[PDB]
Amino acid sequence: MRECISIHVGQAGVQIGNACWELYCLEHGIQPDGQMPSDKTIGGGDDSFNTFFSETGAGKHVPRAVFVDLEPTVIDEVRTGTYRQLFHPEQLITGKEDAANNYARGHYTIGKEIIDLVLDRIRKLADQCTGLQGFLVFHSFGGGTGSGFTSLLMERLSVDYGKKSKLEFSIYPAPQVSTAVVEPYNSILTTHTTLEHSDCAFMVDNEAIYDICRRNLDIERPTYTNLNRLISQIVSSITASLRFDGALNVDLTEFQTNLVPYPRIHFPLATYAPVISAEKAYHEQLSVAEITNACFEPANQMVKCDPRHGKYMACCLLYRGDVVPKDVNAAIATIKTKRSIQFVDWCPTGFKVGINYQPPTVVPGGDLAKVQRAVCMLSNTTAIAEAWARLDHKFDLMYAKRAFVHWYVGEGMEEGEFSEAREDMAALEKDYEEVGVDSV
């Protein structure tokens, strides 16, 4: 009951899924073969970790996940990797030809040939759930599959599973690791098409993660592996309330109630601390106050923007590890006196707190130090529209010359879909301005 199905789309979605499921197994004591010697409920159960893992009679704990990509080489690494025995072959779906960084190919030309099979596999997972709560969809904005196929999948999921909640982890493009000039096109197209079908989306700015890895972990040139291990810690903090239970544990859907004031305004800003190397952590024990203070440093945000130049509509603190409410309250009191936190006049100014007691863990051979306590802040700030503005500006520069548009029209798309998508983004930016203006 309360099961969650994860869907990982394209290279970024799949590789981040690899990092997340590896971390989940370590957090829950699940071996690479799927066995879990602590779970005495063989073949089933209603434990908290059963929201993300089903169980076979042979004692294997199987991720409630589907991996999908339009070319096979990334998922082939899952099929032969360390955690190959975790998944059954039917959960790993590949085509032969990818979307070539072209939204039109992922949504139409190539995606249409595999969408029905993907839905059949998702249905197989859903049929095993006694009370399915919804979906978590991992994908890039910039790739042709991550953009085009995700939006097709989200559209089809709304038809097949009505209003059942769909949450996103979306990889926002960064020039330091980008592979396509047309990523602004793909980002605007998928954001427009998915907007009405997503209940909540956590954007992850690759440049913000890149900068955190360079600054806080002393990594000269972060790789996807560096980025994804940090991303999985943030994803784990967000999903920890679903996979663990406790008396201070606040469910994610309760945070979601505070985080989404209007359907379209559903993009929380995530901030995570502490991100520290083992050589630096060996001296310091970072307190509740220190990690809480770090949540209001813009350098620790998952999306580059300036919340000091926006207004807050919600502020959530998700703690994990050795944390008690007494220390949280004292830390929050200090923050309110010394920090720039302005709310809109129509919402309460308090902070919503959840504490999950199992301490965080790290994958062996990683760069993050294992700490006794961590925190993820989820805030709804109007400042996150700055990320849309940067994308919208790159879109406008290219589209004014119709640069690269022929690649999309050649696959059946019309120029009207570009302008329709761009106008929706303009209205979204104006929506963020409107929500932040004082009442009368």
Binding site: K163, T257, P261, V324, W346, G350
Partner: protein
């Protein structure tokens, strides 16, 4: 034999309800297995009011446990007195209510409400002369608020001539789980105005402040708040559970406390409340003065900002009845400005010889004060701050509600505030 049927709904309702049954089971000499092991016949004289007698001289609470998710009721069943409840009286769903009044009242709650009414009917049919119902719930969530008020309406339909009484926990931004609590509370308060005879207004803001300022609890938990509520609930039901002359049943209590049908929202209070001194003996003057102090009241309203329509005071323990009268008439005559002149002799006093477990003397206060409008004013202000911008409404319109229902609920509670102000100036 005047039986009361008890219902507890939602997280807050079941947590406070479980603690209430723990407390009064100890007072009546009932152990967690349902066996009586006390030493006084006064414990059994009116035990029928809250307990059924099963085979083997065992006592089973006449209690029904309701929730739209199994979590809290699993913890109740695995609790201290969890095995005393009738297993068929656990009625629960799986989807939850998402802190959403519409889900409790119109969608998720409507799927489950008939099963609760089946258990209510079963308990009512085994009553020699049912007097009414008491409901424990919060107004700020979804199940206790939305489904709880749905249950009240359907119970009134099936038992229109019985008394409906609630212990209703009012939300406060200081002890808040979600921002939509003013929405859920405003929708619920209108239901209570129409469909209850007596409602104890328990404000989480007052409970927290008592724990922090008076009890010197630096970090109060919900368990600390529920400890105050269970002690208060035991006090206000003493007249129902032990032999006595005053407010001995729900209807006589309502006739004494409610001069106008919609103004039935009471401010409860308890004394003593002190930091851990603890073994120090308490005197009648000290009980009386504390019981009437705003710091000891649980609705976060200043009674000197309004006027008392009616007051019920219950003293527990061995004490001088003559001395009780002197101090009760003392505070009454010295502060006559705060009692309405057009209801003569509107303060009634009862005394019960059996005190609570750990105290030699205690006092419980039940006030029908026009200052309770401050509570409803606070909720209305918080409601309007969001509704002006239609904030968070999609959670409710997604369940089929229209904005007109919110407008009507807003007008209804402002009307209630205006009604209190009418009699405060009278």
């Amino acid at each position: 034999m005047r039986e009361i049927v008890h219902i507890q709904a939602g997280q807050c309702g079941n947590q406070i309800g479980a603690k209430f049954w723990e407390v009064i089971s100890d007072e009546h000499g009932i152990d967690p297995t349902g066996s009586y092991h006390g030493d006084s016949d006064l414990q059994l004289e009116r035990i029928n009011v809250y307990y059924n007698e099963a085979t083997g001289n065992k006592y089973v609470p006449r209690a029904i446990l309701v929730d739209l998710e199994p979590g809290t009721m699993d913890s109740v069943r695995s609790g201290p007195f969890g095995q005393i409840f009738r297993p068929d009286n656990f009625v629960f769903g799986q989807s939850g209510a998402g802190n959403n009044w519409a889900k409790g009242h119109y969608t998720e709650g409507a799927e489950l409400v008939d099963s609760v009414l089946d258990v209510v009917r079963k308990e009512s049919e085994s009553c020699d002369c049912l007097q009414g119902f008491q409901l424990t719930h919060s107004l700020g969530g979804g199940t206790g608020s939305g489904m709880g008020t749905l249950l009240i309406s359907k119970i009134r339909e099936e038992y229109p001539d019985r008394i409906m009484n609630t212990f209703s926990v009012m939300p406060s931004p200081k002890v808040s789980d979600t921002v939509v609590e003013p929405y859920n509370a405003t929708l619920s308060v209108h239901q209570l105005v129409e469909n209850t005879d007596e409602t104890y207004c328990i404000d989480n803001e007052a409970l927290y402040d008592i724990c922090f300022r008076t009890l010197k609890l630096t970090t109060p938990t919900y368990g600390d708040l529920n400890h105050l509520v269970s002690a208060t609930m035991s006090g206000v039901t003493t007249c129902l559970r032990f032999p006595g002359q005053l407010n001995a049943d729900l209807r006589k209590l309502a006739v004494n406390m409610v001069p106008f049908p919609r103004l039935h929202f009471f401010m409860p209070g308890f004394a003593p409340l002190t930091s851990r001194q603890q073994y120090r003996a308490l005197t009648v003057p000290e009980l009386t003065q504390q019981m009437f102090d705003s710091k000891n009241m649980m609705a976060a309203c200043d009674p000197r900002h309004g006027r008392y329509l009616t007051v019920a005071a219950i003293f527990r323990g061995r004490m001088s009845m003559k001395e009780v009268d002197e101090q009760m008439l003392n505070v009454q005559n010295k502060n006559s400005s705060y009692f309405v002149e057009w209801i003569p002799n509107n303060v009634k006093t009862a005394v019960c010889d059996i005190p609570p477990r750990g105290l030699k003397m205690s006092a419980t206060f039940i006030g029908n004060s026009t200052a309770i409008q401050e509570l409803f004013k606070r909720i209305s202000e918080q409601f309007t701050a969001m509704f002006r911008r239609k904030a968070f409404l999609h959670w409710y319109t997604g369940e089929g509600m229209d904005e007109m229902e919110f407008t009507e609920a807003e007008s209804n509670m402002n009307d209630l505030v205006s009604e209190y102000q009418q009699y405060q100036d009278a």
